[PDB]
Amino acid sequence: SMSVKKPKRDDSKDLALCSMILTEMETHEDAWPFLLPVNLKLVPGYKKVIKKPMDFSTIREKLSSGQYPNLETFALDVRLVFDNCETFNEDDSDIGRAGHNMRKYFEKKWTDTFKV
């Protein structure tokens, strides 16, 4: 409360660390469904169904331009990519399984990097 401050973690490296995690995401062999925005006019239904599209390049743009207030808003956008993927694709479709794989990969790197 007022004039009573809880110790807060050192967040000085958060930008660099999220950037490094994102780079690893981007280089993963299963990243291809998520590298660029979905072709809004080539994937029928995607525009109406997916209310908040997100993808790695858009996350990179936002990260590079100071559009994430904190590391948690960055994680929200990454998870959004995979939540959207789950909504639209079958679990055992190539794109669906890629999403599950990428999510697992992200959450471990997230835990390992920040859950000190």
Ligand X SMILES: Oc1ccc2cc[nH]c2c1
Place of tokens 């401050």: 5
Distance linking the first and last C-alpha atoms of the chain: 26
Least separation in angstroms between residue 51's CB and ligand X is 11
Q: Does 95 bind ligand X (CB under 6 A)?
A: yes
Q: Which of 26, 60, 75, 88 binds ligand X (CB under 6 A)?
A: 88
Q: Does 38 bind ligand X (CB under 6 A)?
A: yes
Q: Does 78 bind ligand X (CB under 6 A)?
A: no
Least separation in angstroms between residue 98's CB and ligand X is 8
Token pair recorded at residue 71: 């590391």
* 53 vs 107 by CB, closer to ligand X: 53
Point out which span in 11-19, 43-51, 61-69, 70-78 binds ligand X (CB under 6 A): 43-51
φ, ψ for residue 3 (rounded to 5)? 65, 20
Angle (CA) 29-74-86 rounded to 5° is: 55
Q: Shortest CA distance to 84 belongs to which of 54, 113, 42?
A: 54
| Contact residues: ligand X, CB under 6 A | 33, 38, 43, 46, 50, 84-85, 88-89, 95
